[PDB]
DNA sequence: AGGCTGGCAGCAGAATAACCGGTGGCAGCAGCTGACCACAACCGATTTTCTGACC
């Protein structure tokens, strides 16, 4: 499926386009590396054919996930552990793994809690990387102008 | 049978990542003052010494 043209997205570097498909030699034998290029600090990613859905390279998404990512961010639900350690720890692996509808989780509750209180730089960082993550997907997703996809997470943190 | 004498050898030293609770400091300021300048006047003799009339 991965020919070029593509918009593929990495677990917690974002969403990358593809250019080239390296045939580098490892061990004598030429395996499929795809290169990738992720814009937020221009980094090449090169992996090889088949070990990028284990490692978790990841489709656009285009349909009603979009919408259930919609009512996960304006869902009832806001619930943490005691300590801020144990809680860091948890938003931090829901983070890490890389799917759409937990960083949606991680920045409404991340979003609520900031809008409440005011936790940290730590977690004001995590919360930046989580919501610049979430809004280049949808916006590289819907193809529906970066910014107006900041403009339309408004909407929906005002829900 | 070892020992304590002898050089011999080797070495130290000197000179040239966040939360929560609590508690005391602290600064800012209306709000009693309360002692204090402080002008500013007002009198209390005081002494001189004319001023005014007295016979």
Wanted: hydrophobic fraction near 40%; aromatic fraction near 6%; glycine fraction near 6%.
């Amino acid at each position: 499926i991965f020919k070029v043209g593509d918009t593929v997205v990495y677990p917690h570097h974002g969403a990358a386009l593809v250019e080239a498909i390296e045939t580098r030699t490892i061990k004598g034998e030429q395996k499929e590396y795809l290169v990738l290029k992720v814009a937020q600090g221009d980094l090449t990613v090169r992996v090889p054919a088949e070990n990028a859905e284990y490692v978790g390279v990841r489709d656009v998404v285009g349909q009603e996930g979009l919408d259930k990512v919609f009512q996960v961010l304006r869902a009832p639900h806001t619930e943490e552990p005691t300590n801020w350690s144990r809680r860091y720890k948890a938003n931090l692996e829901k983070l890490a793994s890389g799917d759409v509808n937990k960083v949606a989780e991680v920045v409404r509750d991340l979003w609520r809690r900031d809008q409440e209180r005011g936790l940290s730089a730590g977690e004001k960082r995590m919360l930046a990387k989580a919501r610049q993550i979430l809004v280049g997907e949808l916006a590289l997703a819907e193809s529906t102008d970066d910014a107006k996809a900041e403009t339309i997470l408004d909407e929906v943190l005002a829900a």
